[PDB]
Ubiquitin-like modifier-activating enzyme 6 (Homo sapiens), 1011 residues
Amino acid sequence: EIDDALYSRQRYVLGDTAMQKMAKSHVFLSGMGGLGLEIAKNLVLAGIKAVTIHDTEKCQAWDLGTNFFLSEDDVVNKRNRAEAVLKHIAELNPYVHVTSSSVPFNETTDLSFLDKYQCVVLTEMKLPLQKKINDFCRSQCPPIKFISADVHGIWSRLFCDFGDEFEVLDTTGEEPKEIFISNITQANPGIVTCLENHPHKLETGQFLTFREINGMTGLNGSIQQITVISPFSFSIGDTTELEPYLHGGIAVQVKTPKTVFFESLERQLKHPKCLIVDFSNPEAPLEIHTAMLALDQFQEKYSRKPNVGCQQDSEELLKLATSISETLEEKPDVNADIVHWLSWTAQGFLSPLAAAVGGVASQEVLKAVTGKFSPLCQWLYLEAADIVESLGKPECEEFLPRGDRYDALRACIGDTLCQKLQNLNIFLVGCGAIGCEMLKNFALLGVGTSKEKGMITVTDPDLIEKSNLNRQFLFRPHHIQKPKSYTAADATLKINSQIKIDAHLNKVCPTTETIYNDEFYTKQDVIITALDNVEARRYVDSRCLANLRPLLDSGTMGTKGHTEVIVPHLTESYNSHRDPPEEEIPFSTLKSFPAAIEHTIQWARDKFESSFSHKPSLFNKFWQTYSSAEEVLQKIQSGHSLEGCFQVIKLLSRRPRNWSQCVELARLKFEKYFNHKALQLLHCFPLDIRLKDGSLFWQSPKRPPSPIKFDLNEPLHLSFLQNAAKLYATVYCIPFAEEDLSADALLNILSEVKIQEFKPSNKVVQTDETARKPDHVPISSEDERNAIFQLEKAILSNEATKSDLQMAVLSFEKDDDHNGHIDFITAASNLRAKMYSIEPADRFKTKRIAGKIIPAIATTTATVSGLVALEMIKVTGGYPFEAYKNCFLNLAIPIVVFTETTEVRKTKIRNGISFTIWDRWTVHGKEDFTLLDFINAVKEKYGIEPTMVVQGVKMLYVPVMPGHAKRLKLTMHKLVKPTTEKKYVDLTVSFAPDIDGDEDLPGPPVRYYFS
Ligand SMILES: O=P(O)(O)O[C@H]1[C@H](OP(=O)(O)O)[C@@H](OP(=O)(O)O)[C@H](OP(=O)(O)O)[C@@H](OP(=O)(O)O)[C@H]1OP(=O)(O)O
Ligand SMILES: Nc1ncnc2c1ncn2[C@@H]1O[C@H](COP(=O)(O)OP(=O)(O)OP(=O)(O)O)[C@@H](O)[C@H]1O
């Protein structure tokens, strides 16, 4: 079986069905350039059972700028490129069998040996050989999935060919959407209306199956094609033959395979299916395809690449391209600038672009070997011409090789910019997979190597986990339970010994802001984030905005990913981005009316939290508050309203003392959860109960629950009982052995267990969606008397010692199998599912949902890292606003979207006075500067009067407060008493609305200086 323990996220990303094909899979790859190296890293991280790399060339000092595994001695010994790194390749995954070859490739070379590979990847060989290879593989039975990837300086090319036909099992990879049926009409085609505010996002031609229909019992399980009518209506073919529609009904999306017809490589040369990544230039892919075809023709003609600055070579290439365009089907325009840049950067090689294209190539290889997603069809082109376009006309002397390990980079971008990279200061936040790939990018880029100014700072407080070995490739098995940052720094220094770097074990937060003060940010030049949560991102945004520093953001959600670029005075902010929050599940829905397995999953998560962390913590905190039980009793007798008294007293009263007591407590909890709750619900609302309009109360989406009889013979019952018993024993520190949860031992204790009889009673029920968690209703004195009797019996039994008040609060772990938390949550969720007869779910899905695990894969990480590095270079160049390109992509399609970053805004306030997010106003006064003096200072310095004052969150002035509007006569040093941490104070004030009736209009924050 798959080693899920390491693979983790990938399982959700792809599906174990696909994983069954990563086993038994055999992949060939040749060329072993930098691009080939990145592709190989991605593939080994993916988990291909067998990989055969191949190369014929040996090590050069030039290659040191493109390979991380390479050492100087490898070039010293003139070793073959593939061989010098094959050993390191095996380090990534023992489960992968990787092999190398050096058999020469030529026009007379036999190819039949390649039959043992499902997919073949080609880099760095001449085009005609590629043509022959494509012919052979696509002529094989079955045709062999062919992929050619190439990089030249600041350019790339990606192509795929899976034969004349390819069966894509899943086009999108999304979950099958579920729709609640509101109305059905007997028609041909029958019109079906969903619930209002429930957009269905269908397309005409899709297919769909149904279940639980009132009326058409026959349509349950039937499959129909659909034509969309409205966002909540559509057609499903003839339905007149059947009953009237009664109610209910569920729409389950049905996925179907699709066929993609890849054409031959050579024919695709004259008819390239170029995908578009920039709508503003839907012709650029065609032009670049022509340009590099002309380059290939030049290399064929001269057996060499053009010399940089050799205008003769550029003119020849331009003539060649001019010739080629006419041969094309469309005969598009010719870009002389593109030809010039190709000739200018032919000899170079760009590492980040290589990483990005390699990630995409690995994704296409996975699609080829799985069919899990619609692959590229057929061409793709990526470029970095923006970078060199900003440089105007630099001379070839900037790009001349100088012997160092960055000669190729110098050829790509020029020596001056290379030096700029060498002297940067980067404060990378978080060291997740994205962070690690980033550090690899700088290490290849020589960033910060200059002892003069280069100083790379990264902080991360977490430790290396086994699952993280799937993606954070810089780490090794013997590094688990060790700081991510230290391991990453050591690996980076191994990659490039010249690098200047520092690490930290800190977590970024306002508490640690003392370390990461404003001056530290001033030291920093570019800030990159690799976070996982949103609020931390917003906090970092606020800090960088206060520090006027550029920031880069990225995120990877499975096949999808996004990059955000923010530049001072040019772009908006991540805070300016205001994405809506999640879709709240009503408190009533979660507590009483589940309809989807996710509801029960969250419910079980919350119940676990309350049962094993929250309530135990309340218990422990209470006993810290109060020394002894006698004191508590005397207080309560004297009317002391001690918080949580009832719940805590009930807890200790039901506190077990032995393993059998743990088992019976678990049994009682099971009865309460899955029998008595449903019974009480039914008592409150019988099955026949109906709404005021007369329709059924127990209609969709509400599901009438059905109580469940216990039986240890049911695997679910036994598992739940075991998990609950173990958790409770851990709570009460009850010693135990693994023989205790043997089923026979359990039922032995269970045989004499007296099951309490259910008893309904009147209870307050919230049902409305917006009806939310009610506050504590005051409790009758009768229950206080009950609790008093309980603690009386406890003290009389002397079951009140300090140890009797000691208990170990649990912490929710999700990655370890032996804490049982995942098992318990799975048992509870499945039980609740059957409780309402809702569809069950597997353990792993429950773990993902409850743990809020975001699926991630190596390829998306590498690709976004490449793009982020590119944007970092663009930042370093100080390029104008137009160059930077915010990127969003969904490799599931696959699709790459390039767009200009959102421009900054001049927020006008009054009479044309406009301020951007980058504007922080300031005022200088003295110790006597009162609040009103500050009002006047604002009014004079920016022509606007304040109307309320907040220091951070401190409401310092508002007209609706009578007793504190007098603060106007008070200087801040005595009014707010600013902290000694700052020479200044940072504020935010809104002003009188121009619309009299509206609220105060916010303005830029102000840093006031006391002198
Ligand atoms: O406080 P919560 O953990 O959120 O859950 C409570 C709790 O059930 P547990 O005891 O199983 O945790 C209550 O029990 P007590 O804490 O009061 O002993 C129970 O109340 P009853 O004992 O009176 O049944 C109540 O159920 P209800 O609100 O229906 O009375 C139930 O609520 P949830 O489990 O739905 O949160
Ligand atoms: N406030 C913070 N300060 C520092 N590092 C942070 C902060 N918040 C998150 N991080 C880091 O962000 C990184 C995110 O990494 P990544 O997205 O690969 O997954 P993860 O958090 O390690 O866990 P999982 O793989 O289960 O998603 C973590 O290594 C974590 O240490």
Observations:
- The longest helix spans residues 597-625.
- The pocket of adenosine-5'-triphosphate (ligand 2) is lined by residues 430-433, 459-462, 467-468, 484, 507-509, 530-532, 536, 853-854 (CB under 6 Å).
- Residues 83 and 100 are 7 Å apart (CA to CA).
- The chain has 33 helices and 33 strands.
